[PDB]
Write a protein that holds these residues in place. Structure first.
Motif, PDB file in Angstrom:
ATOM      1  N   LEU A  79       0.819  -1.206   0.000  1.00 43.50           N
ATOM      2  CA  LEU A  79       0.000   0.000   0.000  1.00 43.50           C
ATOM      3  C   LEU A  79       0.858   1.263   0.000  1.00 43.50           C
ATOM      4  CD1 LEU A  79      -3.010   1.047   0.310  1.00 43.50           C
ATOM      5  CD2 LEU A  79      -2.388   1.377   2.713  1.00 43.50           C
ATOM      6  N   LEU A  80       0.714   2.079  -1.039  1.00 43.04           N
ATOM      7  CA  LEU A  80       1.495   3.302  -1.134  1.00 43.04           C
ATOM      8  C   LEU A  80       0.854   4.422  -0.319  1.00 43.04           C
ATOM      9  CD1 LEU A  80       2.350   3.336  -4.952  1.00 43.04           C
ATOM     10  CD2 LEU A  80       3.729   2.469  -3.057  1.00 43.04           C
ATOM     11  N   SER A  81       1.679   5.391   0.058  1.00 40.74           N
ATOM     12  CA  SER A  81       1.210   6.608   0.695  1.00 40.74           C
ATOM     13  C   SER A  81       1.218   7.750  -0.320  1.00 40.74           C
ATOM     14  CB  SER A  81       2.068   6.946   1.912  1.00 40.74           C
ATOM     15  OG  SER A  81       2.012   5.913   2.876  1.00 40.74           O
ATOM     16  N   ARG A  82       0.874   8.953   0.153  1.00 40.07           N
ATOM     17  CA  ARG A  82       0.825  10.097  -0.749  1.00 40.07           C
ATOM     18  C   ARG A  82       2.216  10.515  -1.211  1.00 40.07           C
ATOM     19  NH1 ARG A  82      -4.720  12.445   0.214  1.00 40.07           N
ATOM     20  NH2 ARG A  82      -4.366  13.412   2.265  1.00 40.07           N
ATOM     21  N   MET A 138       5.955  -3.879 -19.650  1.00 37.73           N
ATOM     22  CA  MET A 138       6.296  -5.294 -19.631  1.00 37.73           C
ATOM     23  C   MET A 138       5.150  -6.162 -20.137  1.00 37.73           C
ATOM     24  SD  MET A 138       8.497  -5.242 -16.094  1.00 37.73           S
ATOM     25  CE  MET A 138       9.295  -6.730 -16.681  1.00 37.73           C
ATOM     26  N   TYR A 139       3.910  -5.799 -19.806  1.00 43.54           N
ATOM     27  CA  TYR A 139       2.717  -6.528 -20.248  1.00 43.54           C
ATOM     28  C   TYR A 139       1.688  -5.521 -20.731  1.00 43.54           C
ATOM     29  CZ  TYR A 139       5.234  -9.905 -17.371  1.00 43.54           C
ATOM     30  OH  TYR A 139       6.215 -10.693 -16.806  1.00 43.54           O
ATOM     31  N   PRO A 140       1.797  -5.070 -21.984  1.00 37.25           N
ATOM     32  CA  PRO A 140       0.914  -4.004 -22.483  1.00 37.25           C
ATOM     33  C   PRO A 140      -0.520  -4.436 -22.748  1.00 37.25           C
ATOM     34  CG  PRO A 140       2.282  -4.798 -24.247  1.00 37.25           C
ATOM     35  CD  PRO A 140       2.775  -5.487 -23.006  1.00 37.25           C
ATOM     36  N   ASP A 141      -0.835  -5.726 -22.683  1.00 36.07           N
ATOM     37  CA  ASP A 141      -2.190  -6.192 -22.945  1.00 36.07           C
ATOM     38  C   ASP A 141      -2.983  -6.452 -21.676  1.00 36.07           C
ATOM     39  OD1 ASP A 141      -1.927  -6.158 -25.768  1.00 36.07           O
ATOM     40  OD2 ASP A 141      -0.889  -8.090 -25.701  1.00 36.07           O
ATOM     41  N   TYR A 142      -2.406  -6.190 -20.509  1.00 35.42           N
ATOM     42  CA  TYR A 142      -3.044  -6.471 -19.231  1.00 35.42           C
ATOM     43  C   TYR A 142      -3.679  -5.209 -18.675  1.00 35.42           C
ATOM     44  CZ  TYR A 142      -3.714  -8.434 -14.550  1.00 35.42           C
ATOM     45  OH  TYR A 142      -4.248  -8.857 -13.356  1.00 35.42           O
ATOM     46  N   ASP A 143      -4.881  -5.360 -18.122  1.00 39.22           N
ATOM     47  CA  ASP A 143      -5.628  -4.217 -17.603  1.00 39.22           C
ATOM     48  C   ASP A 143      -5.111  -3.886 -16.209  1.00 39.22           C
ATOM     49  OD1 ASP A 143      -6.957  -4.480 -19.960  1.00 39.22           O
ATOM     50  OD2 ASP A 143      -8.953  -4.762 -19.088  1.00 39.22           O
ATOM     51  N   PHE A 144      -4.014  -3.140 -16.174  1.00 42.15           N
ATOM     52  CA  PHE A 144      -3.524  -2.645 -14.904  1.00 42.15           C
ATOM     53  C   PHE A 144      -4.373  -1.457 -14.471  1.00 42.15           C
ATOM     54  CE2 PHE A 144       0.240  -4.793 -16.635  1.00 42.15           C
ATOM     55  CZ  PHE A 144       0.613  -5.567 -15.553  1.00 42.15           C
ATOM     56  N   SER A 145      -4.472  -1.273 -13.159  1.00 39.54           N
ATOM     57  CA  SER A 145      -5.309  -0.241 -12.569  1.00 39.54           C
ATOM     58  C   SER A 145      -4.528   0.534 -11.524  1.00 39.54           C
ATOM     59  CB  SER A 145      -6.553  -0.855 -11.922  1.00 39.54           C
ATOM     60  OG  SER A 145      -7.146   0.046 -11.003  1.00 39.54           O
ATOM     61  N   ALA A 146      -4.670   1.861 -11.555  1.00 36.50           N
ATOM     62  CA  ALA A 146      -3.950   2.696 -10.603  1.00 36.50           C
ATOM     63  C   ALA A 146      -4.396   2.423  -9.174  1.00 36.50           C
ATOM     64  CB  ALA A 146      -4.128   4.173 -10.953  1.00 36.50           C
ATOM     65  N   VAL A 147      -5.659   2.034  -8.974  1.00 34.99           N
ATOM     66  CA  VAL A 147      -6.135   1.780  -7.616  1.00 34.99           C
ATOM     67  C   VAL A 147      -5.567   0.463  -7.085  1.00 34.99           C
ATOM     68  CG1 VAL A 147      -8.182   3.153  -8.119  1.00 34.99           C
ATOM     69  CG2 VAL A 147      -8.318   0.673  -8.314  1.00 34.99           C
ATOM     70  N   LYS A 148      -5.649  -0.610  -7.882  1.00 33.41           N
ATOM     71  CA  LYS A 148      -5.142  -1.891  -7.407  1.00 33.41           C
ATOM     72  C   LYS A 148      -3.627  -1.916  -7.373  1.00 33.41           C
ATOM     73  CE  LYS A 148      -7.625  -4.554 -10.264  1.00 33.41           C
ATOM     74  NZ  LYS A 148      -8.047  -5.877 -10.793  1.00 33.41           N
ATOM     75  N   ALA A 149      -2.971  -1.143  -8.243  1.00 32.41           N
ATOM     76  CA  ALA A 149      -1.521  -1.022  -8.152  1.00 32.41           C
ATOM     77  C   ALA A 149      -1.127  -0.187  -6.947  1.00 32.41           C
ATOM     78  CB  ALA A 149      -0.952  -0.423  -9.434  1.00 32.41           C
ATOM     79  N   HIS A 150      -1.892   0.869  -6.665  1.00 32.92           N
ATOM     80  CA  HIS A 150      -1.703   1.616  -5.429  1.00 32.92           C
ATOM     81  C   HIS A 150      -1.822   0.689  -4.228  1.00 32.92           C
ATOM     82  CE1 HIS A 150      -3.543   3.852  -2.011  1.00 32.92           C
ATOM     83  NE2 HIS A 150      -2.656   4.784  -2.310  1.00 32.92           N
ATOM     84  N   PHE A 175      -1.105  -2.777  -4.448  1.00 35.06           N
ATOM     85  CA  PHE A 175      -0.133  -3.863  -4.535  1.00 35.06           C
ATOM     86  C   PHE A 175       1.313  -3.403  -4.400  1.00 35.06           C
ATOM     87  CE2 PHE A 175      -3.235  -6.189  -7.579  1.00 35.06           C
ATOM     88  CZ  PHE A 175      -4.052  -6.470  -6.503  1.00 35.06           C
ATOM     89  N   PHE A 176       1.600  -2.134  -4.663  1.00 38.57           N
ATOM     90  CA  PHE A 176       2.954  -1.623  -4.531  1.00 38.57           C
ATOM     91  C   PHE A 176       3.236  -1.270  -3.079  1.00 38.57           C
ATOM     92  CE2 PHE A 176       2.877  -0.911  -9.166  1.00 38.57           C
ATOM     93  CZ  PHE A 176       4.162  -1.279  -9.494  1.00 38.57           C
ATOM     94  N   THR A 177       4.446  -1.586  -2.625  1.00 42.68           N
ATOM     95  CA  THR A 177       4.875  -1.255  -1.274  1.00 42.68           C
ATOM     96  C   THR A 177       6.274  -0.670  -1.311  1.00 42.68           C
ATOM     97  OG1 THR A 177       3.615  -3.171  -0.554  1.00 42.68           O
ATOM     98  CG2 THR A 177       4.997  -2.036   1.076  1.00 42.68           C
ATOM     99  N   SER A 199       8.065  -2.827  -4.093  1.00 39.64           N
ATOM    100  CA  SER A 199       7.798  -4.226  -4.376  1.00 39.64           C
ATOM    101  C   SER A 199       6.366  -4.354  -4.868  1.00 39.64           C
ATOM    102  CB  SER A 199       8.041  -5.104  -3.138  1.00 39.64           C
ATOM    103  OG  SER A 199       7.294  -4.656  -2.023  1.00 39.64           O
ATOM    104  N   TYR A 200       6.180  -5.169  -5.896  1.00 35.31           N
ATOM    105  CA  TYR A 200       4.870  -5.411  -6.480  1.00 35.31           C
ATOM    106  C   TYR A 200       4.381  -6.788  -6.049  1.00 35.31           C
ATOM    107  CZ  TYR A 200       1.146  -5.363  -9.966  1.00 35.31           C
ATOM    108  OH  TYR A 200      -0.064  -5.389 -10.609  1.00 35.31           O
ATOM    109  N   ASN A 201       3.262  -6.816  -5.327  1.00 36.85           N
ATOM    110  CA  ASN A 201       2.696  -8.032  -4.741  1.00 36.85           C
ATOM    111  C   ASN A 201       1.210  -8.076  -5.062  1.00 36.85           C
ATOM    112  OD1 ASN A 201       5.232  -8.552  -2.969  1.00 36.85           O
ATOM    113  ND2 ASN A 201       4.523  -6.507  -2.377  1.00 36.85           N
ATOM    114  N   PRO A 202       0.843  -8.578  -6.232  1.00 40.93           N
ATOM    115  CA  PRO A 202      -0.573  -8.659  -6.606  1.00 40.93           C
ATOM    116  C   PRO A 202      -1.295  -9.812  -5.910  1.00 40.93           C
ATOM    117  CG  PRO A 202       0.785  -9.587  -8.334  1.00 40.93           C
ATOM    118  CD  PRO A 202       1.737  -9.030  -7.313  1.00 40.93           C
ATOM    119  N   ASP A 203      -2.624  -9.806  -6.055  1.00 38.46           N
ATOM    120  CA  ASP A 203      -3.475 -10.810  -5.412  1.00 38.46           C
ATOM    121  C   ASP A 203      -3.528 -12.117  -6.200  1.00 38.46           C
ATOM    122  OD1 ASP A 203      -3.965  -8.912  -3.503  1.00 38.46           O
ATOM    123  OD2 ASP A 203      -6.027  -8.476  -4.138  1.00 38.46           O
TER     124      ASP A 203
END
Length: 178
Positions: free
Chosen positions: A50-53, A69-81, A83-85, A137-141
């Motif tokens: 979880l990122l901070s401001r 790296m994966y241009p066909d994947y629906d990345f989202s700023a909210v879920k990346a916000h 998953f990133f730490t 670090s990127y830690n998706p679900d």
């Protein structure tokens, strides 16, 4: 530069398990597709408010590197916000000495000189100023995220970001059974 490490970790076999490592350097663009992507991403994350401001800025570029790296994947700023730490060099160091100890041992038995972590520190430092970096670090679900391979024993996705240079280096390393 990065090529020696990527060749060393290009499907490195330790008899029954295999270590995969990939270093990639990225210079952030503010023209073309990435400009539009940045506008859309910051609109998604601001509209979500979880990122901070203090990392709200880096988040954007982080997602941009993901798209590269994966241009066909629906990345989202909210879920990346989510998953990133943000991490420290010390935490990454401990992760590297604990998990990549067999790779560092195989490195020391093959090259006389700098250890594996030392060589990594020098390459990362050349591309982005490590004392001035921000580490993430990127830690998706789900396994559906392309940064999480199904069946892997362990997987790590680190990003080294430099604000003054607008540069990001991606370090991926995982271990697989045969």
């Amino acid at each position: 530069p990065l090529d020696r490490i990527n060749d060393f970790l290009d499907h490195l076999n330790l008899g029954e398990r295999t270590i995969k490592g990939c270093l990639e350097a990225y210079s952030c663009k503010h023209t073309g597709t990435d400009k539009r992507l940045s506008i859309s991403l910051e609109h998604e994350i601001l509209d979500y408010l979880l990122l901070s401001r203090s990392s709200r800025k880096a988040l954007i570029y982080l997602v941009l590197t993901l798209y590269h790296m994966y241009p066909d994947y629906d990345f989202s700023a909210v879920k990346a916000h989510q998953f990133f730490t943000e991490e420290s060099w010390n935490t990454f160091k401990q992760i590297f000495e604990t998990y990549m100890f067999e790779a560092s041992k195989e490195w020391s038995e093959t090259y006389g000189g700098s250890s594996l972590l030392e060589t990594l520190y020098k390459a990362l430092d050349e591309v982005v100023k490590l004392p001035e970096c921000e580490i993430y670090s990127y830690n998706p679900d789900s396994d559906s995220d392309p940064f999480l391979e199904k069946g892997a024993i362990w997987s790590f996705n680190f990003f080294f970001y430099n604000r003054k240079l607008k540069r990001v280096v991606s370090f991926r390393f995982s271990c697989l059974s045969n």
